Design a protein around this motif. Structure first.
Motif, PDB file in Angstrom:
ATOM      1  N   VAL A  45      20.206  65.777  12.653  1.00 36.47           N
ATOM      2  CA  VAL A  45      19.548  65.394  11.685  1.00 36.47           C
ATOM      3  C   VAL A  45      19.172  63.970  12.342  1.00 36.47           C
ATOM      4  O   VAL A  45      19.910  63.323  12.740  1.00 36.47           O
ATOM      5  CB  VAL A  45      20.486  65.138  10.443  1.00 36.47           C
ATOM      6  CG1 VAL A  45      19.803  64.294   9.509  1.00 36.47           C
ATOM      7  CG2 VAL A  45      21.105  66.179  10.038  1.00 36.47           C
ATOM      8  N   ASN A  95      17.724  60.418  11.992  1.00 29.65           N
ATOM      9  CA  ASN A  95      17.539  59.490  10.635  1.00 29.65           C
ATOM     10  C   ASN A  95      17.483  58.059  11.313  1.00 29.65           C
ATOM     11  O   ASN A  95      18.503  57.675  11.868  1.00 29.65           O
ATOM     12  CB  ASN A  95      18.905  59.705   9.810  1.00 29.65           C
ATOM     13  CG  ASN A  95      18.912  58.641   8.984  1.00 29.65           C
ATOM     14  OD1 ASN A  95      17.961  57.977   8.552  1.00 29.65           O
ATOM     15  ND2 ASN A  95      20.149  58.777   8.033  1.00 29.65           N
ATOM     16  N   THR A 155      15.174  54.166  12.065  1.00 29.54           N
ATOM     17  CA  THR A 155      13.982  53.363  11.872  1.00 29.54           C
ATOM     18  C   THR A 155      13.785  52.358  13.199  1.00 29.54           C
ATOM     19  O   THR A 155      14.601  52.157  13.887  1.00 29.54           O
ATOM     20  CB  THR A 155      14.613  52.344  10.698  1.00 29.54           C
ATOM     21  OG1 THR A 155      15.459  51.415  11.102  1.00 29.54           O
ATOM     22  CG2 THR A 155      15.017  52.929   9.520  1.00 29.54           C
ATOM     23  N   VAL A 169      10.288  54.207   9.546  1.00 26.78           N
ATOM     24  CA  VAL A 169      11.289  55.082   9.352  1.00 26.78           C
ATOM     25  C   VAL A 169      10.825  56.812   9.990  1.00 26.78           C
ATOM     26  O   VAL A 169       9.661  57.161   9.753  1.00 26.78           O
ATOM     27  CB  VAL A 169      11.753  55.477   7.905  1.00 26.78           C
ATOM     28  CG1 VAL A 169      11.945  54.136   7.494  1.00 26.78           C
ATOM     29  CG2 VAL A 169      10.552  55.930   7.114  1.00 26.78           C
ATOM     30  N   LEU A 176       9.707  66.054  12.949  1.00 29.84           N
ATOM     31  CA  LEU A 176      10.098  64.485  12.477  1.00 29.84           C
ATOM     32  C   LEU A 176       8.929  64.312  11.817  1.00 29.84           C
ATOM     33  O   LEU A 176       7.685  64.702  11.879  1.00 29.84           O
ATOM     34  CB  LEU A 176      10.224  63.999  14.038  1.00 29.84           C
ATOM     35  CG  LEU A 176      11.439  63.933  14.633  1.00 29.84           C
ATOM     36  CD1 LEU A 176      11.422  65.513  15.323  1.00 29.84           C
ATOM     37  CD2 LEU A 176      11.544  62.916  15.575  1.00 29.84           C
ATOM     38  N   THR A 177       8.901  63.574  10.817  1.00 23.97           N
ATOM     39  CA  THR A 177       8.251  62.796   9.876  1.00 23.97           C
ATOM     40  C   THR A 177       8.173  61.251  10.300  1.00 23.97           C
ATOM     41  O   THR A 177       9.253  60.566  10.224  1.00 23.97           O
ATOM     42  CB  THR A 177       8.272  63.036   8.495  1.00 23.97           C
ATOM     43  OG1 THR A 177       8.317  64.537   8.268  1.00 23.97           O
ATOM     44  CG2 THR A 177       7.200  62.476   7.884  1.00 23.97           C
ATOM     45  N   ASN A 225      12.550  60.532  10.353  1.00 19.18           N
ATOM     46  CA  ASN A 225      13.283  61.622   9.614  1.00 19.18           C
ATOM     47  C   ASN A 225      13.085  63.011  10.013  1.00 19.18           C
ATOM     48  O   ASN A 225      11.846  63.039  10.356  1.00 19.18           O
ATOM     49  CB  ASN A 225      13.142  61.403   8.122  1.00 19.18           C
ATOM     50  CG  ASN A 225      13.889  60.052   7.611  1.00 19.18           C
ATOM     51  OD1 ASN A 225      12.967  59.348   6.814  1.00 19.18           O
ATOM     52  ND2 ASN A 225      14.998  59.683   7.817  1.00 19.18           N
ATOM     53  N   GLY A 226      13.987  63.486  10.266  1.00 22.07           N
ATOM     54  CA  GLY A 226      13.521  65.121  10.624  1.00 22.07           C
ATOM     55  C   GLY A 226      14.791  65.929  10.933  1.00 22.07           C
ATOM     56  O   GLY A 226      16.049  65.286  10.740  1.00 22.07           O
ATOM     57  N   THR A 227      14.740  67.016  11.013  1.00 24.29           N
ATOM     58  CA  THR A 227      16.034  68.160  11.581  1.00 24.29           C
ATOM     59  C   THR A 227      15.272  68.583  12.771  1.00 24.29           C
ATOM     60  O   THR A 227      13.950  69.326  12.846  1.00 24.29           O
ATOM     61  CB  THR A 227      16.259  69.130  10.255  1.00 24.29           C
ATOM     62  OG1 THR A 227      15.057  69.809  10.047  1.00 24.29           O
ATOM     63  CG2 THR A 227      17.079  68.185   9.436  1.00 24.29           C
TER      64      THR A 227
END
Ligand SMILES: [Cu+2]
Ligand SMILES: [Cu+2]
Ligand SMILES: [K+]
Ligand SMILES: [Zn+2]
Ligand SMILES: [Zn+2]
Lengths: 165, 164
Positions: free
Chosen positions: A108, A110, A112, A40, A28-29, A42-44
């Motif tokens: 996924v 995703n 915020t 935010v 994850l970022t 985001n990652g997988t």
């Protein structure tokens, strides 16, 4: 000013299971442009069991025992509120809700968030463990005695420390 | 802001991977007050005999594994050159050498006054602690990276410094 409080901050978490869950791997970022900004995420992740899984930031960052958390401290909670959904006003800082893994085991991520911080405010999440739970977070609405403690999402599948890029 | 109060305890779970997955250890960091000294204690097992550089790097990113050769920069918010922990010119992350004997055990007991467990510019939480292949030359080595990183080679093991 102290550079920890400046500019965009990027954080990451390397997610991994162990033992029978060693096939759960991902990252994850976390990105927060400014002190007052949203974050935010985001990652997988691959290798997960299909369905929803709670995604929580724990009070401890201690991984000397792997994804086994010795302390009884619970979710990151500097404002001493009860467990909630990310959109609830009564939530822990660490309450990021559920993520979803499809039937191929891919998730996924995703989302915020406006409560966590990548800046050293009291909502700082760097240096803490991010947890992917066995089952879904009931968002404090399940009527279980632990619903308002942690959403009753069960054990841990996979963990990683949130740290600076 | 509780991140700047009381005593702060941090830990690093140290592990190698691949041919060095037998390298395992942990270190505890204790700093009772902002700008107070930091006391470091722990052990590491499974290491090749001899001295090994011990440095906090600028990055905390473990998402490409420990053995990358992309993140060789030591934690250096004050833009000084590499040195020994006691040198005046040093990086925040310069913790010198640990020693592993023939048992492969390294026993670590250090006190530092440069790193911080509080979020001042010397903050080390959220960064990777690195154990290197060979020794840190403490900036006295004559290689062109002696003053950059002590010419300690690749990495044997890593761990993110995080809150207890
Ligand atoms: Cu949880
Ligand atoms: Cu180094
Ligand atoms: K100091
Ligand atoms: Zn919670
Ligand atoms: Zn250095």
């Amino acid at each position: 000013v102290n550079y920890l409080f400046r500019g965009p901050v990027t954080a990451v978490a390397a997610i991994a299971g162990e033992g029978e869950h060693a096939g759960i791997k991902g990252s994850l970022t976390f990105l927060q442009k400014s002190l007052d900004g949203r974050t935010v995420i985001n990652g997988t992740i691959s290798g997960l069991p299909e369905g929803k899984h709670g995604l929580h930031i724990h009070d401890s960052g201690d991984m000397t025992k792997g994804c086994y958390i010795t302390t009884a401290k619970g979710h990151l909670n500097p404002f001493n509120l009860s467990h909630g959904a990310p959109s609830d006003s009564a939530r822990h800082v660490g309450d990021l809700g559920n993520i979803y893994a499809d039937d191929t085991g891919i998730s996924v991520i995703n989302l915020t968030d406006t409560v966590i911080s990548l800046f050293p405010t009291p909502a700082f999440v760097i240096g803490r463990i991010l947890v992917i739970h066995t089952t879904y977070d009931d968002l404090g609405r399940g009527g279980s005695p632990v619903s308002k403690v942690n959403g009753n999402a069960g054990g841990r599948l996979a963990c990683g420390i949130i740290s600076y890029v």
